[PDB]
Amino acid sequence: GAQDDVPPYFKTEPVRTQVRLEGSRLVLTCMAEGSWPLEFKWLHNNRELTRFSLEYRYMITSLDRTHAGFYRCIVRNRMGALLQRQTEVQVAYMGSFEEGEKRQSVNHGEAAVIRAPRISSFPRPQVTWFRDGRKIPPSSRIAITLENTLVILSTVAPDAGRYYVQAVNDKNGDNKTSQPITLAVENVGGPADPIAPTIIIPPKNTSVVAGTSEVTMECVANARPLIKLHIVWKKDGAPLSSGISDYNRRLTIANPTVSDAGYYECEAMLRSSSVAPVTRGAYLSVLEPPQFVREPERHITAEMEKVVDIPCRAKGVPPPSITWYKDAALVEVGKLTRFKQRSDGGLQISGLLPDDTGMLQCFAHNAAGEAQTSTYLAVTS
Ligand SMILES: *[C@@H]1O[C@H](CO[C@@H]2O[C@@H](C)[C@@H](O)[C@@H](O)[C@@H]2O)[C@@H](O[C@@H]2O[C@H](CO)[C@@H](O)[C@H](O)[C@H]2NC(C)=O)[C@H](O)[C@H]1NC(C)=O
Ligand SMILES: *[C@@H]1O[C@H](CO)[C@@H](O)[C@H](O)[C@H]1NC(C)=O
């Protein structure tokens, strides 16, 4: 036949996540190819936003937090339709510190744990601790946790005054200062007797998606005298001699994969001492986004009234769920329908009608991501 019948496809897929500034102009794109004319239609959180249009771009003139969320387009032409992989638009912003001043106490020789003041913001801001206008960096006796929690180890009388933070939003440059947390050190000035080692900030069960550059476990401990305090990290019972930083309070695993998943434990102990060591540990879980193992031929031809199977096999951690679309419409695979979904993921269509012709598209989804693959089904006479 004289006319072109190249079905729609995506030249490129959109980013999974993108942070954009409040009030900026946002231009989402459907980078689709296929025989002309191609029409485009947009979804926001799976609710229709626009009607089919020749325009492949969706433009938001000024972006606010209401317009955040998931976007995906549907593209069609004479052949059929495809559903795009969605992108999450995240609107950067920052408010102001609203909690107000706080008062906190700690006993001599114990550690003061001061959570950082909460501020509404995206992304999470860069937090710096201050006291008396001077920055408070990590040291032998001062820890700062992955959550910007200040931990003052083996507190003494001078460790008392007003502590506050500075928050900087690296996307919009905003710079705000919190209300102080006032710290009191009590029962000051006894004999500086030794205090047995305790773990104040224990390892957290941690998840990370493969492809992430780094994952960190954290363990903050207290003892008196601090100079004798020693932190040892263990994987599978054997001490780790690499990847440790930040006064032994951190363990870094570079480019983690499932091989690095398992139980990591932290042991706090005192050198030249008879005191018992204390151990706390957690599980590192590594997720893998869906990857196709088998994708269908881009074209499948089957005879009318016959049966056809369309393969779709994907791997992932956790094992991904599989969803079928016919021209961007969810396929209903309930009984009393000609459509059955295989255990290996494949879609089986029986009693083929000529209307079954068109794009069949398969999504593999899990918490770590989504992948899509498709084929043109032609039902011949
Ligand atoms: C941290 O999580 C574990 C369980 O996590 C799962 O099991 C691991 C073996 C590993 O497969 C991880 O990737 C999993 O996500 C919690 O362990 C449970 O602890 C309770 C008692 O507290 C016990 O009765 C259950 O049997 C445990 N469950 C399992 C599956 O082992 C552990 O408590 C978590 N630690 C936290 C939240 O601090
Ligand atoms: C935030 O503002 C204060 C006051 O102008 C300034 O001293 C500080 O350096 C700023 N922080 C950053 C990260 O720019």
Author numbering: -1 to 379
Paper text:
The Ig1:Ig1 interface, for both Sdk1 and Sdk2, is centered on N22, which hydrogen bonds with the main chain of R23, and is supported by interactions between hydrophobic residues (L19, V25). These results—particularly the Sdk2 N22S mutation—highlight the critical importance of N22 and the two hydrogen bonds it forms to the dimer interaction. Consistent with this, a crystal structure of Sdk2Ig1–4 H18R/N22S showed a loss of the back-to-back dimer interaction.
Sdk1 and Sdk2 are single-pass transmembrane proteins, with extracellular regions composed of 6 N-terminal immunoglobulin (Ig) domains followed by 13 fibronectin type III (FNIII) domains, and a relatively short intracellular domain terminating in a Postsynaptic density/Discs Large/ZO-1 (PDZ) binding motif. Overall, our data suggest a model in which Sdks form cis dimers on isolated cell surfaces, which dissociate to form trans dimers through the same interface when contact is made to a cell surface expressing the cognate Sdk.
